[PDB]
Design a protein around this ligand. Structure first.
Ligand code: NAG
Ligand code: NAG
Lengths: 97, 97, 305, 51, 48
């Protein structure tokens, strides 16, 4: 199960943010025009309406994936390994073939 | 394939070259406050967990007990083994004894 | 590289869509992620405030720290007996650590964290399908006395364990409208207690600067086309979609996520022993089970139905 | 008053170790606007008219 | 018979001659603490 962590979005104000490609898992960078960022305490930048917001979204394993994980394998062919108990003349022999 | 098993893949748990197609979609924000609105397909691992069927410890033919580390099938009969034995001459005794 | 000093890290104000007033809201406690992948019903909650740490970050049990609701953003203490966790009824709090909690909860549909103070009754809530989870092949409300003692996986109650790491970066700009005042159609910058303020106005040109003093910098027209924020803020914060990154948004630190899944032996119920009546080429099982119980049959031939 | 879903409405006055409570039948279920069910309203949305 | 009607019987309610054939099985105690583990067939009176 993945984690799909989304970082803090990048803002530039009266300026562009053409996103740079990255090698992270399922990277998605996308640019937003006409945004007005606003956290608590007031509007977060000067530029009135021509703002660019680079929104970033990649994906990552969950912290608990070290236990609940599924491993994919190929199976080509299987060969027996049998343990044989052979007794003869009051003498025993346990051996793997 | 998004929304199915194998949507996120990696060679190891601690590996860095993680590849994924989770069908993540970035949406233009609507409210004045800051947030990154993303719509994503559900985890294919969870869907496969919910629709796993029964494992091979409960459906393997011939009564084969499936065990792991290593992957193997133990203690089941499905045929005949022609065994050739070279019994030493010390085991035999003469007919007069 | 994964440090746990906590004297160089800070909490943040989160945006979560349900406080006490049932609206999208700012809270000092913001649940970021919930991981209900245990086997005893215990869940791990990632709250935007630190826990078990004092004013300065020294390890101090039964105190926690958050970002206050004031212009001078002082990191403020509160006692941990006021913390409450609920899903449908109250949750037992099992473990606490910076950014992370371990709580045992009844089944429900929403995870809620609250501060039960005399005046501050802040709360936050996320949607999470916390369901009744059992290990084995027979369902149970709570594990019984008699059991089989099979292997399961349990969140460790100790805070010393680690299930991975989380990235921590330096904070970005966090603008205030209280640091700008419009007088006679002109802008004033008002720093409280003489603290240094970095400002950026673009009504004439990209005019940056720093002041600790009231300034008619270019005069300008309105305060809505300019900003001013704090500079003396180099305390690491975990990256979140309710913050703004700084321009050098690289991994400044890594923080341990506690409560690793330890493999643990744990009991499961033993069902009633079946009564088998034998008739030619078949058997009949008389099965009594108060709770749902899994029956799995297979033939030992070529076709295992 | 805002209430969780239930099958009754109950009013009480915890005065003098006597609640003096009253209970009435009412089918209260979580109603939702629009065409997508939600436990609580989200951040992103379409801002549909409701009452 | 167990799990059905008539699992426990007596001529009168106050009689000490009470007969029953419920499938009660005593299990081997496993945990450290003292108790009795027992599994019983569900009472056939409630099933009826
Ligand atoms: C998935 O899980 C739910 C949980 O209630 C269950 O009802 C459903 O049958 C499962 N399978 C599918 C295909 O939805
Ligand atoms: C503000 O900056 C000045 C010089 O830039 C420095 O001397 C002073 O200590 C700073 N004050 C604070 C509170 O950071």
């Amino acid at each position: 199960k993945f984690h799909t962590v989304v970082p803090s979005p990048q803002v530039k104000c009266c300026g562009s943010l053409e996103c740079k490609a990255s090698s992270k898992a399922d990277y998605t960078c996308r640019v937003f025009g006409g945004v007005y960022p606003f956290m608590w305490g007031g509007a977060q930048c000067f530029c009135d309406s021509e703002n660019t917001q680079l929104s970033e979204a990649y994906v990552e394993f969950a912290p608990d994936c070290t236990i609940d994980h599924a491993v994919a394998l190929k199976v080509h062919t299987a060969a027996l390994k049998v343990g044989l108990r052979i007794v003869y003349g009051n003498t025993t022999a346990r051996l793997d073939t | 394939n998004p929304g199915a098993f194998g949507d996120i893949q990696a060679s190891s748990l601690d590996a860095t070259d993680i590849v994924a197609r989770t069908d993540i979609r970035l949406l233009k924000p609507s409210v004045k406050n800051i947030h990154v609105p993303y719509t994503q397909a559900v985890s294919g691992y969870e869907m496969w967990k919910n629709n796993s069927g029964r494992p091979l410890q409960e459906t393997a033919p011939f009564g084969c007990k499936i065990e792991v580390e290593p992957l193997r099938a133990t203690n089941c009969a499905y045929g005949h083994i022609p065994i050739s034995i070279d019994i030493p001459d010390a085991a035999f005794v003469r007919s007069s004894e | 590289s994964i440090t746990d000093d906590f004297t160089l890290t800070s909490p943040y104000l989160g945006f979560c869509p349900y406080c006490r007033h049932s609206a999208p809201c700012f809270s000092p406690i913001k649940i970021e992620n919930v991981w209900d992948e245990s086997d005893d019903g215990s869940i791990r909650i990632q709250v935007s405030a630190q826990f078990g740490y004092n004013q300065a970050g020294t390890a101090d049990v039964t105190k926690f720290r958050y970002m206050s609701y004031d212009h001078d953003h002082d990191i403020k203490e509160d006692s941990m007996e006021k913390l409450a966790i609920s899903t449908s009824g109250p949750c037992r709090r099992l473990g606490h650590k910076g950014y992370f909690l371990l709580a045992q909860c009844p089944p429900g549909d929403s995870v809620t964290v609250s501060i039960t103070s005399g005046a501050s009754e802040n709360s936050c809530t996320v949607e999470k399908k916390i369901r009744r989870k059992f290990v084995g092949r027979e369902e149970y409300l709570f594990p019984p006395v008699h059991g089989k003692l099979v292997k399961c996986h349990v969140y460790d109650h100790l805070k010393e364990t680690s299930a991975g790491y989380i990235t921590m970066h330096r904070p970005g700009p966090h603008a205030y409208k209280s640091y700008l005042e419009e007088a006679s159609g002109e802008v004033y910058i008002k720093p409280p207690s003489g603290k240094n303020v970095t400002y950026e106005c673009k009504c004439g040109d990209y005019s940056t600067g720093i002041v600790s003093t009231r300034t008619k910098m270019n005069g300008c027209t309105k305060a809505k086309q300019c900003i001013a924020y704090k500079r003396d803020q180099t305390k690491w914060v975990f990256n979140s979609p309710d913050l703004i990154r700084h321009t050098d948004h690289s991994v400044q630190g890594k923080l341990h996520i506690p409560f690793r899944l330890t493999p643990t032996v744990c009991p499961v119920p033993l069902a009633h022993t079946p009564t088998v009546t034998k008739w030619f080429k078949g058997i009949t099982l008389h099965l009594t089970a108060t709770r749902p119980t899994l029956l799995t049959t297979r033939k030992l031939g070529l076709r295992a139905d």
